[PDB]
Design a protein around this ligand. Sequence first.
Ligand SMILES: Nc1ncnc2c1ncn2[C@@H]1O[C@H](CSCC[C@H](N)C(=O)O)[C@@H](O)[C@H]1O
Ligand SMILES: [Cl-]
Ligand SMILES: [Cl-]
Ligand SMILES: [Cl-]
Length: 255
Amino acid sequence: RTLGEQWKEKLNAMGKEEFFSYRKEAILEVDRTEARRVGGHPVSRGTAKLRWLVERRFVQPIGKVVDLGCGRGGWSYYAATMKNVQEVRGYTKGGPGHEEPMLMQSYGWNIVTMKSGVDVFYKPSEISDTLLCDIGESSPSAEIEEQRTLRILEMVSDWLSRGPKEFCIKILCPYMPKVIEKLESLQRRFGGGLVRVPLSRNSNHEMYWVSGASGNIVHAVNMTSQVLIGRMDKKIWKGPKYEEDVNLGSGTRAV
Ligand SMILES: Nc1ncnc2c1ncn2[C@@H]1O[C@H](CSCC[C@H](N)C(=O)O)[C@@H](O)[C@H]1O
Ligand SMILES: [Cl-]
Ligand SMILES: [Cl-]
Ligand SMILES: [Cl-]
């Protein structure tokens, strides 16, 4: 079995307390204690991760942006603040137990449309310039997550065949053999590479297939596996490192 599976088995074996501590050890963490009181305060902690990728040119949203699994709309409102973005369309399932789009008046809200009650697995693909997808339901089973990840990759493939040259797709479980194989074919066809965003907690192995990255998928996945494993069983927990939360400003925008 893979290093990923080993990390997963170990994680699952962790006690409640150990787990809580491990979760944010040496990670990058936003100060959300100000976001909780529009004043350009992002909806969620997902905003910071997209900002991390874009700041480093791993993805450059442009034109018509589609955001699959938009939830409250962190990614959708962020994309609306990008210079070359003209329209942002979000889709999310909503409903009991799930996140509803939160209406904001951060900068470019006038160009953001978010539709709830949409299961994107049954939604026919449409043309976009930039495809964002942040779907992935966790499970202690690597096997279960493998199958979910593959279902999302199959769904993402259909939108990516409509011509977006910019993309950012969450890979819930990048370390399983069948996912690794599918990523390689998808990389061959559409390019990009896998990146580990350091704001992600150590309790998950999520990586982002981003169009501005490149390189050997297996190596990148294995590197993350090892870093995550190296952070377990610490003598002293030093905690997370912080950065300022994103500014989304306010008001309508011209396009
Ligand atoms: N099949 C599906 N169709 C549409 N939305 C789904 C879905 N499966 C899961 N989701 C939704 O996808 C979301 C992913 S979390 C979205 C976070 C967002 N990027 C932000 O920054 O706010 C969850 O809110 C979940 O309800
Ligand atoms: Cl899922
Ligand atoms: Cl996370
Ligand atoms: Cl403007």
